[PDB]
Write a new protein. Structure first.
Lengths: 140, 149
């Protein structure tokens, strides 16, 4: 199992994996999200590969003040193998390497698995409300 | 009132404004924070200038999926002039201009005024928990600064 940067050739395989991990939402066009990432900086968009197949992802990022992580997924048949942790551990190292001082992540309260992973990785709850505003509406 | 990008020359004036606006925290060194933006991409770090002086800021940003905003402040003597709204609108337009599809801003839980303000600007509260992990410890640096003593 190896962690590496996303490549353009992984496009369709990643989208299929996201579908299999129930990560897609109607308001985010995954094709558009990958294109945005490619255009901006692909270097923190990581994939986990096992036997030549992409079985996990994290779309990591840095905005010049805080790090981020979206689209964290592990194929349902590859759970309990340390892949999500390997992805986040590598992301954190890439973030520190470029001077990012802190990573932030939002998770729905009902996602007890993702929440639990982050708590075990040393993430702490922030006493804040996350407010959002859509700027460009995607198609489904 | 001119909204423009932060420049090197604004460095001290902005830190003084942040101190005045009670935006400094012990765990974020403002010189380090500004240097990080300079090194990464200064373009979404906006300032508002009135009569030649910097009176407002927003440290905007984009990570390739979502936009962000930190260090939003307006000098106390320049309130009621729409400066915060003008800064945020300009940031949102710069974000749109580069294809950013959404901006998200975290606000303290106990600030109903600030929550109300953002709701009126078209922001909505997300049903999520917010977690964080410090990666580099600014407060461990032993250099002493003239600001925030």
């Amino acid at each position: 199992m190896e962690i590496r940067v996303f490549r353009q050739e992984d496009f369709e395989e990643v989208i299929t994996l996201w579908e299999r991990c129930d990560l897609l939402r109607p308001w985010n066009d995954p094709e558009m999200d990958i294109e945005r990432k490619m255009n901006h900086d692909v270097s923190l968009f990581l994939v986990a590969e096992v036997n030549g197949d992409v079985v996990g992802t994290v779309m990591g990022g840095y905005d010049g003040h805080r790090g981020s992580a979206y689209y964290l997924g592990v194929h349902p048949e590859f759970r309990g193998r340390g892949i999500a942790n390997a992805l986040l551990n590598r992301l954190e190292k890439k973030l520190i390497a470029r001077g990012c001082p802190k990573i932030q992540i939002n998770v729905p309260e009902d996602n007890d698995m993702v929440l639990g992973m982050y708590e075990r990785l040393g993430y702490e709850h922030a006493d804040v409300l996350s407010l959002g505003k859509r700027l460009i509406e995607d198609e489904e």
